[PDB]
Amino acid sequence: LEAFGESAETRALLGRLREVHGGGAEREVALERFRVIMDKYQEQPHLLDPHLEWMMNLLLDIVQDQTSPASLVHLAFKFLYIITKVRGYKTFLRLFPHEVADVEPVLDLVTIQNPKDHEAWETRYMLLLWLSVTCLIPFDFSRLDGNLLTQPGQARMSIMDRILQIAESYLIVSDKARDAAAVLVSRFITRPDVKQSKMAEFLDWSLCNLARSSFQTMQGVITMDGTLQALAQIFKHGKREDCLPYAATVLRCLDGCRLPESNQTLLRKLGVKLVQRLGLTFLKPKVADVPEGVERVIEQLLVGLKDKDTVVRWSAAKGIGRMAGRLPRALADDVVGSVLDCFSFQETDKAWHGGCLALAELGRRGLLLPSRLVDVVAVILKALTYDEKRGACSVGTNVRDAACYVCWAFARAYEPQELKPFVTAISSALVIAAVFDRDINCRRAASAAFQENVGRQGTFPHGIDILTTADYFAVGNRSNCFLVISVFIAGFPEYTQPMIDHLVTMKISHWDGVIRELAARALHNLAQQAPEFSATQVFPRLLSMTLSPDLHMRHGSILACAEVAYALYKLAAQENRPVTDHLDEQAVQGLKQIHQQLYDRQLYRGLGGQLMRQAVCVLIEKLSLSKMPFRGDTVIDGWQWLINDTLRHLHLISSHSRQQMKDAAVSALAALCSEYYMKEPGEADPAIQEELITQYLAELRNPEEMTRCGFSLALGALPGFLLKGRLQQVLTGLRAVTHTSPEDVSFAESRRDGLKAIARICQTVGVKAGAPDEAVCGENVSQIYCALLGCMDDYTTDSRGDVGTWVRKAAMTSLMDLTLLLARSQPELIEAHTCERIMCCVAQQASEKIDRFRAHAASVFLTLLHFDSPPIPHVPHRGELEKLFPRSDVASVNWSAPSQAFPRITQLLGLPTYRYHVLLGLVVSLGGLTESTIRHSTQSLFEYMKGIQSDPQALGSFSGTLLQIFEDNLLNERVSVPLLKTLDHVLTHGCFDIFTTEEDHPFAVKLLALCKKEIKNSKDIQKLLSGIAVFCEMVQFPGDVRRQALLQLCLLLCHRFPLIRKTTASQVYETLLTYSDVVGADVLDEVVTVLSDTAWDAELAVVREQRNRLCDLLGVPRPQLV
């Protein structure tokens, strides 16, 4: 925002006040419009400075007119107040009028205010501040009154007297006017005449208010806060020789008031404020004989730093800083020593915030002496690292903020030579914090302090270089500070060992898991800039931390060890040398005892068992990916075991960390099998290959589900050299699970994982034409495609919902991974029928009603269609599909959004091979329950039907396909109601208006019979309603079908459920009102009356007669009891 680009709108809104002050709806609209326009500049209202005056004068020529009604004046004052909250009063009041002709017009307006009118509080607020901006006039209030003895019988009261009676009344109110009363007295008693006239009276009133008021009675607390604020403002904006005489009685009364013990945060803050206001009245202002009251003031202000709230701690720190700046240089040392006591071992973390704030306030003025450098600094080094856990919450944010504030105030508290001794401990602190700090406020707080230090002083090692990179915006993302900027800072030798030490000490022992993972990932990269230091000093450290009793510390140390080992292996892989060159025998000896020291302490149980398993699996993966020298050693046999047990106890892991555990275990198994299970180049161990495979295969039949789910992915992660002659068995074992058996009905995750495992195995072994038990060949490629397609019709619906859909997802990602592979090896294997079936299935799963599975299906379809290297052979209407989905438009498509998917999927009906499946899939969305999906699908279907409604051939083929879909899903509860609703919608829209010309069309003649057979003996209410609607829509077709529909509608009118009886008549009324040719005008006034008068929800025996009577009118044979 560079300028106010809403001047005309605001001007019009302000001008409309004179013709919107008599409205209640328009008034609120204009207010809400003025508020939202002014709130845009709440973060930078200075841009509105050039406009302030004109808008202010506009609002003033409405409240400064004599023909202005109270209501119109109240809206102007509300607007005026809206401009004083955004710009603030201290800056917006300087433009208000201040002429001597504005003293009585403003006091007289202040004397017509209703104190009991809560709706007009903005008016009173704007009144008091205006009256206060008018007390600056450089004249005596006496010159203005003139002659008071002009009214005989009753003398007029003086202006000054009226103002004293206005301030005392507004200083005991409960609205916001009391705050405006605090700003008025500050500019009323601080002038010469008022000082000599009413100062004593106001002081007696205040001392009486704070001598009778309490912090328990509500109005008493209201009287306490206002009096304290008034006293503080008077002592702040008051002369020191007119005030010092009263400083002795004010403190004596405040001491007896007992504020520290009172249970009010505002009262204590105001009390500390008033105590620091009186404290400076005794000393002389300095520009860089100690009365006894100063000691009492200091004793009160040094007890306001241990408060339980920060609002009082900040005030106490400000008071201490303002007092130290006025006292001599001798008492300053004692004050600093007394303030330093807040950082004692027995003091809580709350006392540390106040101490650091006081230290910063003292350093800002330059009062700390050099002798206080070895101590104060020694404390700051700790305050920057304050981060403790007090039960379930964490504390240390405000401590670090105050530490950064103190650091930022040391660039002007000492000379460059005075602070030259601690530029190696403070530069390392600032940098370390700005780099690893958790909170973003502290990080940027440490960034600004370092900038100020390098700007003012400029003695820190590489100040400009560290400031250019680690700037205010660069430290915004925490991830960028740990993995990028950290390495850049460590590039220099002055910020390498300290940062690594701070990371290994505190960050590794942190309570947050994400922070530990980030610290480990940062150490991974930092080890590159210091391999020797990380291999000789950090590795022993982390190794000793893996034997700690702390769980989080053990996990962090294990992660750090794994990351350092991986980094050392990567670094050594460049020079083509073994990883043992970095780690010593003792180091590789301790990496073979981590797991045996955990399993022997039973550290794999409880809530920490999952974390320990994750850490050990990550360590095993990082060690196997480095080709460590543990081949032949029994330690390997241990690692493998720890994996199996995990896959055997996955159900024990929480539901919020089982997928990650399974993935990590599978990755560790994959890294281990392709490293420690190889006998020769290209071969594998016969004993292990046999035992592991037999165990895994026999495990697939365990009735437990999570075990099968884990072992599936385990099989799907084995290398290729271990399946050179065992594929014919692994594939059969995986396919045996993909089948749905009577016992494994609700077992969907097992098959979902088996499909993914088959995908991975097929991808690893590849294609070799001739070798069935070694690779995917033309002998074991058909079975695979048949097993993958048999899991695409998984519509299992249970109490958990449509869980089968999950399996379908695994069928879309698996079938793809196979196809793309064949095209990249032996495209001939991709048969035409199989490819057509896969495409039709993908089309159906992309025309579904769920939004996340439908979106996944469209992406898979586009990926399979946009494959050109080489082009997948046997693609029905390939060119048609390519023209319908150009590559340029696919870059921006919201497939998840039905609006941006249904109109693009409905066009597939034009293709014969897709027309059937696509419609079977779209029926579920056209007859589902989602309203938006129903609307979008119906609109997209009508947009396509409009193009083939006047075509007897296209419309006929569409109706035939719809009826074939209906027949194929006869008596199917998942396709009966949705398809019936779709037919009802299509009939209501009038798409089949051509078949209604002749009589007895082959379409309706069988559609009616199918609907009858579907609704024959049905108790579902939704199904009954759908059938009734279909039979009430099918009446448009003349011939025997019309008479049969009327007989069915009469049969349904007398159903067991009165609700159905009423709904049938309600729908028949609409059907008769729609089609007029169905019934002649000679018996039309006889049907509507019988339907409106007869109560179809009453006795069924009585309604049978009325219903039978409607059979003698419609001309429908009257049924009987069979």
Partner: protein, 437 residues
């Protein structure tokens, strides 16, 4: 001699305890204030009723009980009740927050703050006793303070006092009395948790007692007072063996040897007769063979099952009042010549009979009537397995959806607890089927 301590947790538990103590005071003649005019050995000593009442200096008979609850509402009625002078103020323990029908809360969150106080109170109460037998805990399975806290206290009592029995008097919930849908979820958890810390367990089917009150007692809508009185009558008929120096079941360790031949199988079936209404005070008369033939009726049992199919493992009859051994023998011969029954031939236990020559007692002004003789049959049977087949079934109905399960995991326990609990249920069912053959 040896005494006993009864811990009453939950609402139903404290109600049953109050009813039992009222009935005991009415039988022994102890007035509400705690004045036994029949007692002569003041200060202390050894008597038949001393196993459940501690004597003070002023002759006050303080019941040896501990009523604990996580809410002050329920204990307020006891503190302000007619028996306020009977129980000691310290024996009543209250809590500020309840479990809201949750097992994890009562076993972790709220239980961890009150378990220490409960253990301290139990230790203080046991310091006066010279020889304790066990801990008669009273709870149910439809709440979170009756299952969770009960299991948490059993876990600590099995470690503090391992050489002491641990009898229970659970209350099997019903779908008509159910107050929550996660009522089963609590049941399974506490059942799996007290298996190795409980010798004998007594379960009360809510529907069975409801139907008994509707039919026998003749009540339109039986309330919780009507069901708390019958449970007190049952508890008194069962504890008469310990309160009157009965020959059969002299101590608590005999309940495990007579009615618990197998450690895992410890859920006997308890039935009682007769059940006359207050209106029909002198309408019909029942012999010792007409009341012993009424305890072999499914509708007269406390749990709905069909013992005629399965076989019995044990059997203990207890008569209370005017009963001659000849009448008992005649009733046994009648039961042995009329009804067809099966029994485990390889069981290390058999049939036992005991008599207590004491007149029955009923709460004056209540719905029950004073009878001349009473019978109580405690027989372990495989038919109780049916009572489980229902409970477990509901668990499955709530396991396929995992509804309301996250509330239990987000309080302390993990997810493997449910698999362990249902795995413990499968093993129990297999053991029952094996014993039934």
């Amino acid at each position: 001699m040896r005494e006993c301590i009864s811990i009453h947790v939950g609402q139903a538990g404290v109600q049953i305890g109050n009813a039992c103590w009222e009935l005991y005071c009415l039988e022994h003649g102890i007035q509400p204030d705690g004045q036994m005019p029949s007692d002569k050995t003041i200060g202390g000593g050894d008597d038949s009723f001393n196993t459940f009442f501690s004597e003070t200096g002023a002759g006050k008979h303080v019941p040896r009980a501990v009523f604990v609850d996580l809410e002050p509402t329920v204990i307020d009625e006891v503190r302000t009740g007619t028996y306020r002078q009977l129980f000691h103020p310290e024996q009543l323990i209250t809590g500020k927050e309840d479990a809201a029908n949750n097992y994890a809360r009562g076993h972790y969150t709220i239980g961890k703050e009150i378990i220490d106080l409960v253990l301290d109170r139990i230790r203080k109460l046991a310091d006066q006793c010279t020889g304790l037998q066990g801990f008669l805990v009273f709870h149910s399975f439809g709440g979170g303070t009756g299952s969770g806290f009960t299991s948490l206290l059993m876990e600590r009592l099995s470690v503090d006092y391992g050489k002491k029995s641990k009898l229970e008097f659970s209350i099997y919930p019903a779908p008509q009395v159910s107050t929550a849908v996660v009522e089963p979820y609590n049941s399974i958890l506490t059942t799996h948790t007290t298996l190795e810390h409980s010798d004998c367990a007594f379960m009360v089917d809510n529907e069975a007692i409801y139907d008994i009150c509707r039919r026998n007692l003749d009540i339109e809508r039986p309330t919780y007072t009507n069901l708390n009185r019958l449970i007190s009558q049952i508890v008194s008929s069962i504890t008469a063996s310990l309160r009157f120096d009965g020959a059969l079941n002299v101590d608590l360790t005999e309940f495990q040897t007579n009615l618990v031949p197998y450690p895992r199988i410890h859920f006997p079936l308890a039935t009682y007769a007769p059940v006359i209404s207050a209106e029909k005070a002198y309408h019909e008369q029942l012999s010792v063979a007409e009341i012993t033939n009424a305890c072999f009726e499914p509708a007269n049992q406390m749990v709905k099952c069909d013992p005629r199919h399965g076989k019995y493992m044990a059997c203990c009859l207890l008569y209370r009042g005017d009963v001659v051994p000849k009448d008992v023998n005649a009733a046994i011969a009648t039961i042995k010549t009329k009804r067809s029954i099966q029994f485990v031939d390889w069981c290390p236990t058999g049939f036992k009979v005991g008599i207590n020559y004491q007149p029955p007692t009923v709460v004056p002004g209540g719905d029950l009537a004073k009878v001349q003789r009473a019978v109580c049959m405690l027989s372990n049977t495989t038919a109780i397995a049916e009572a489980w087949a229902r409970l477990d079934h509901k668990f499955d109905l709530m396991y396929a959806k995992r509804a309301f399960v996250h509330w239990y995991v987000g309080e302390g326990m993990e997810e493997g607890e449910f698999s362990e609990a249902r795995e413990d249920m499968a093993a129990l069912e297999k053991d029952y089927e094996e014993v039934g053959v």
